[PDB]
């Protein structure tokens, strides 16, 4: 996971094309998506909407470069300003990237108020990128041992824990930063007690919070950003994946106290980074999410989709709870069942699920999901679970 | 920086703002835009794939990134390929490869020996290879274990390399630090001295690779074969995507790179334009179209050298060249002047103006930027 996949790792399934909630393979099978390619497409395959969205921007520019402006970018970053409630927007390629951004942005407000050397606090049993800043950022010793030395000045608290995390704390703390949901260890969303926590010490000790939203974010929670739910505002938040709906596109933002002391004399004040392609797609995202009302369809959904995978935990003793936050839910199994089995099976059944944690199923599916579906995957996933 | 034009779109060489005004595309975008702007078969092969599927995960095959994949092991002459979003990704995943590579050797943290007037990338691994004290100092402490030796310089090589050097890393041809080729018998002494001591020789390829050189990848020019190397910008010409490749020796001393379903990043989108490049560049003949015309380019800049006192030198390969300007002219201001002339030109180095037109470049076109930049230089 912290560098190149091998054989073992990946399906053997050849994708080729792709229409609503439905991925389709070379052999033409048809199955339900209820991954969405890892929490990025949202609006599920060949959106009509989206696609001549992309498809308009294609004949028109691709590439600037940072040293012209270009209005997709504006209105790009205009939108997720809006919808992160921060103020100042950075495109990146990818959500590693986006990390990076976040680390050195952390890095720089410190070392402007004379604190060199920022040290960060992340929380065991994350994950947050491949590229060696953000690799610096997992507690696993094995995602990192090969690459070591890393960034120093990390250290690793308990997630939920608020204690642990004062604990570490110092004069030097420059950023304590949380995905809004966990994942690697299983999926695991922070308590709205424990986001309120942090938010107030990170007031008091002017240490900057950084909500990392890029698993959870773009509506995956029933709202635009999980730290929503919180009711708490984040200085900095990463985001990715389905900003771009399939598009690679990553960004961090900024809240005003960040940005009056760690951008420099020289600052246009203006959006940095993206292109005119992803930042088009970006627009369309939201809005389209607007238009079909997708956040409504999550919380409208959401409760069928818990109740549905309840219902599965009650039929089979060997799937143990269940936790998530919207369309982000995650199922532990009894070591008696190997999770790879059950999502071969469930491939099998034409239904397409992926795993976390020791051995938990992840559900992922499209935002644009129907009632329908989850009744689809319900009786897949059951049959599944059945001959186990 | 930021120049105040709104680019709008573009046709060929040509750019236009939001107020309609035609530019001569001088720059591709930072050396993106190979095939410059709205080329009608590359557009075509690129929403022929939006039609079809943007995004899988690396969890699932797709006939486009094996073919993109098998395109440029090809036009590298490298074994394997492993795609990301970006040329600072590219660098990173190369940095931890080889890192990888000499720990499975017995040699913990590996380190890295990069080059003065270098520059990577911004992700934290990569701007740990970069030379200047200032592009990191807020955000110390960064990776441990780079030291900078002199481009084109050997002896300074010898002296920096120690047990735990793992690899060396260069750009082919030094460009936002001042265009500087690396000489062909530099080349091969760092190929020479990675072999004797089993160190990996990095090709970092982001600005000068894909057909600017007048081959695939300026390294060729050296006649030498680095065991990483990394790609971008042109790679997609405007989509974003970037490339790490190794070499077989690397592939089969790691389990994950030599093991031949393995992948790193990709997407279908990106890999079709991929593809598409490849295609293209071989229907189109666009690397004999810079061999063709880089010598009169670099006639047409010799010619502005003679003509004005404050240009003093031109460097360059293929279609990447650059012209130092004297203290006593700010490069900025000649870049304004000849945004007012409708072209566009960008800098680097200390003072000077750096040239990266679209490999699609017509004779016609040099002369364009000619009377447009003389005329600039006129008014100084
Ligand atoms: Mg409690
Ligand atoms: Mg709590
Ligand atoms: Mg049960
Ligand atoms: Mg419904």
Redesign the interface.
């Known amino acids: 996971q ?6 073992y ?10 229409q609503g909630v439905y ?1 389709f393979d ?1 052999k033409a099978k048809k199955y339900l998506d209820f ?1 969405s ?2 929490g ?2 949202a609006l599920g ?2 959106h009509a909407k989206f ?1 001549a969205k ?2 308009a921007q ?14 997709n970018i504006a209105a790009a970053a205009k939108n997720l300003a809006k919808a992160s409630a921060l103020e100042r927007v950075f495109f990146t ?2 959500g ?2 986006s990390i ?1 951004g976040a ?2 942005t952390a ?2 407000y410190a ?2 108020k004379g604190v ?2 920022g040290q960060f606090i992340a929380f065991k049993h994350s994950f947050h990128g ?4 953000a690799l ?1 950022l997992t507690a696993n010793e094995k995602y990192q ?9 990390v250290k690793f608290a308990k997630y939920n824990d608020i204690s642990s995390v004062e604990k570490l704390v110092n004069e030097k703390t420059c950023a304590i930063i949380l995905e809004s949901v966990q994942g690697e260890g299983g999926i695991n969303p922070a308590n709205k007690d424990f986001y309120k926590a942090l938010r107030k010490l990170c007031d008091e000790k002017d240490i900057l919070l950084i909500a990392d939203e890029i698993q959870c974010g773009m509506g995956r929670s029933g709202k635009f950003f999980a730290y929503e739910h919180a009711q708490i505002l984040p200085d900095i938040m990463t985001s990715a994946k389905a900003l771009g ?5 990553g960004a961090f933002v900024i809240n005003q106290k960040v940005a009056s002391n760690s951008l420099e004399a020289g600052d ?1 004040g ?1 959006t940095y980074g993206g ?4 930042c088009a797609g970006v627009n369309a995202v939201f809005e389209i999410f607007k238009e079909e009302k997708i956040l409504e369809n999550v919380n409208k959904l959401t409760p069928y989709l818990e109740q549905s995978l309840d219902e599965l935990i009650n039929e089979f003793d060997f799937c143990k709870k269940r936790k998530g936050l919207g369309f982000m839910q995650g199922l532990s199994l009894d070591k008696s069942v190997k999770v790879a089995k059950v999502i071969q099976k469930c491939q099998e059944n034409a239904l397409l699920l ?1 795993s976390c944690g020791e051995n938990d199923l992840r559900f992922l599916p499209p935002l644009i999901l129907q009632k329908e579906h989850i009744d689809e995957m319900s009786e897949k996933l059951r049959k599944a679970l059945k001959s186990f």
Do not use: A, Q
């Open positions: 912290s560098h190149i996949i091998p054989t790792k990946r399906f053997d399934i050849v994708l080729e094309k792709g991925l070379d991954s390619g890892i990025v497409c395959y060949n696609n992309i498809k294609v004949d028109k520019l691709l590439h600037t470069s940072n040293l012209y402006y270009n209005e390629n990818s590693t990237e990076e680390m050195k890095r720089k070392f402007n060199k050397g491949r590229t060696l800043g610096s041992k090969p690459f070591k030395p890393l960034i120093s000045g709906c399939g598009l690679s596109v246009h203006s292109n005119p392609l992803v992926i």
